Amino acid sequence: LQATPPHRRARSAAWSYIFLPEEAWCDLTIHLPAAVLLKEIHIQPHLASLATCPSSVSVEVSADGVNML
């Protein structure tokens, strides 16, 4: 969430998730202090090891922050 991204050649991904052998999806819930007019979502994969970039991303949005759709 930090506004300042790490250097593009950083050898370690800022965040990493180890998948269980039966897990296909990991989830990250961002709660905001108040509702905003969301227009874009930017996700920066670890450029040094692009093999760990997710194959696909499913975006759910909750106007009330409780019932994701």
Binding site: R9, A10, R11, S12
Partner: protein, 173 residues
């Protein structure tokens, strides 16, 4: 130019040992701060245990003073938490630096330097995560002591609240 590339390799060796010095220093400062945090954690844990022993009116002239001391302990522990977390941010900064330095080493063929740096990083990270394990045990034990403090407070004050309702019913009703 083999001489040029060799001087380059030794320069990267210098970067690697200066980054290992900084990483060691940041690890030592981090370990110290983690240790003092853990100290305040175990202190606050014991203080909560004492306060739990002082729950109820049994010694208000003690309960309120252990409470104040607990406030000071909370403040110390939390300020040290933030401090050692900034320190750990700097530590991860140093780890990233030393890794990028190993990256430059491998690039210049200072493989010996690269491996030395990598093994230094592993040693440092293991020792850090050992003091981190101690800190996480201390935090778990503080959490458990606080949980038991909350149980005992909610039980004793709940019974006292029921008694207060009954005592209000003893009169005029």
């Amino acid at each position: 130019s083999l001489s040029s590339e060799a001087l380059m390799r030794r320069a990267v060796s210098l970067v690697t040992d200066s980054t290992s010095t900084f990483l060691s220093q940041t690890t030592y400062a981090l370990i110290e701060a983690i240790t003092e945090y853990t100290k305040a954690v175990y202190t606050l844990t014991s203080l909560y245990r004492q306060y739990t022993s002082l729950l109820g009116k049994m010694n208000s002239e003690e309960e309120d003073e252990v409470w104040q001391v607990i406030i000071g302990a909370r403040a110390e522990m939390t300020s040290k938490h933030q401090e050692y977390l900034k320190l750990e941010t700097t530590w991860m900064t140093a780890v990233g630096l030393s890794e990028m330095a190993a990256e430059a080493a491998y690039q210049t063929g200072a493989d010996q330097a690269s491996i030395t740096a990598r093994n230094h990083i592993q040693l440092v990270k293991l020792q850090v995560e050992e003091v981190h394990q101690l800190s996480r045990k201390a935090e778990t034990k503080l959490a458990e002591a606080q949980i038991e403090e909350l149980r005992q407070k909610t039980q004793e004050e709940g019974e006292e609240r029921a008694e207060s309702e009954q005592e209000a019913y003893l009169r005029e009703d």
